[PDB]
Design a protein around this motif. Sequence first.
Motif, PDB file in Angstrom:
ATOM      1  N   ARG A   6       0.897  -1.290   0.007  1.00  0.00           N
ATOM      2  CA  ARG A   6       0.202   0.061   0.098  1.00  0.00           C
ATOM      3  C   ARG A   6       0.741   1.093   0.150  1.00  0.00           C
ATOM      4  O   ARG A   6       1.811   1.348   0.563  1.00  0.00           O
ATOM      5  N   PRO A   7       0.553   2.226  -0.879  1.00  0.00           N
ATOM      6  CA  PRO A   7       1.383   3.561  -0.715  1.00  0.00           C
ATOM      7  C   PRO A   7       1.435   4.339   0.533  1.00  0.00           C
ATOM      8  O   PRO A   7       2.326   5.018   0.884  1.00  0.00           O
ATOM      9  N   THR A   8       0.295   4.033   1.407  1.00  0.00           N
ATOM     10  CA  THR A   8       0.438   4.600   2.784  1.00  0.00           C
ATOM     11  C   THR A   8       1.409   4.012   3.714  1.00  0.00           C
ATOM     12  O   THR A   8       1.597   4.628   4.627  1.00  0.00           O
ATOM     13  N   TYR A   9       1.989   2.784   3.432  1.00  0.00           N
ATOM     14  CA  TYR A   9       3.065   2.362   4.143  1.00  0.00           C
ATOM     15  C   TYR A   9       4.035   3.368   4.370  1.00  0.00           C
ATOM     16  O   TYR A   9       4.458   4.145   3.314  1.00  0.00           O
ATOM     17  N   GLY A  10       4.968   3.272   5.341  1.00  0.00           N
ATOM     18  CA  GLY A  10       5.984   3.962   5.430  1.00  0.00           C
ATOM     19  C   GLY A  10       7.416   3.352   5.147  1.00  0.00           C
ATOM     20  O   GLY A  10       7.316   2.271   4.492  1.00  0.00           O
ATOM     21  N   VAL A  11       8.577   3.986   5.499  1.00  0.00           N
ATOM     22  CA  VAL A  11       9.722   3.643   5.388  1.00  0.00           C
ATOM     23  C   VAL A  11       9.947   2.125   5.638  1.00  0.00           C
ATOM     24  O   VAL A  11       9.316   1.834   6.787  1.00  0.00           O
ATOM     25  N   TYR A  16      10.907  -2.599  -2.661  1.00  0.00           N
ATOM     26  CA  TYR A  16      11.945  -2.504  -2.860  1.00  0.00           C
ATOM     27  C   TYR A  16      12.599  -3.312  -4.008  1.00  0.00           C
ATOM     28  O   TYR A  16      13.220  -4.356  -3.684  1.00  0.00           O
ATOM     29  N   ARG A  17      12.391  -2.636  -5.280  1.00  0.00           N
ATOM     30  CA  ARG A  17      12.892  -3.678  -6.371  1.00  0.00           C
ATOM     31  C   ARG A  17      14.422  -3.775  -6.119  1.00  0.00           C
ATOM     32  O   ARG A  17      15.113  -2.641  -6.277  1.00  0.00           O
ATOM     33  N   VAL A  18      14.805  -4.848  -6.346  1.00  0.00           N
ATOM     34  CA  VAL A  18      16.480  -5.388  -6.149  1.00  0.00           C
ATOM     35  C   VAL A  18      16.887  -6.101  -7.486  1.00  0.00           C
ATOM     36  O   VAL A  18      16.086  -7.122  -7.758  1.00  0.00           O
TER      37      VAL A  18
END
Lengths: 49, 49
Positions: A6-11, A16-18
């Motif tokens: 969800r975009p609402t999630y924080g850091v 994280y595309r790796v």
Amino acid sequence: QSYGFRPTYGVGHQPYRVVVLSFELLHAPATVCGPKKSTNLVKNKCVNF
Amino acid sequence: RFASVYAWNRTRISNCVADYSVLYNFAPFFAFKCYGVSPTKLNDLCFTN
């Protein structure tokens, strides 16, 4: 199990595309090489090969 | 109500089985750097406290 994002999630929870590159520079027939210009070959003279 | 730095909150942990893998969903975890003990094999360590 589900790995929803969800975009609402924080850091630390944002996706994280790796991409990880694996090398095998072990002394062996080398193919993939960098952009170094090849020079003429010289024999019987001290050089920095 | 996380305490201010000048008066930090100290919490006693007593006899328990603590799994250091269900806490990854409890915080964003911007940085999880660790000292002499590594969290990788932490779930295999027994602490005095």
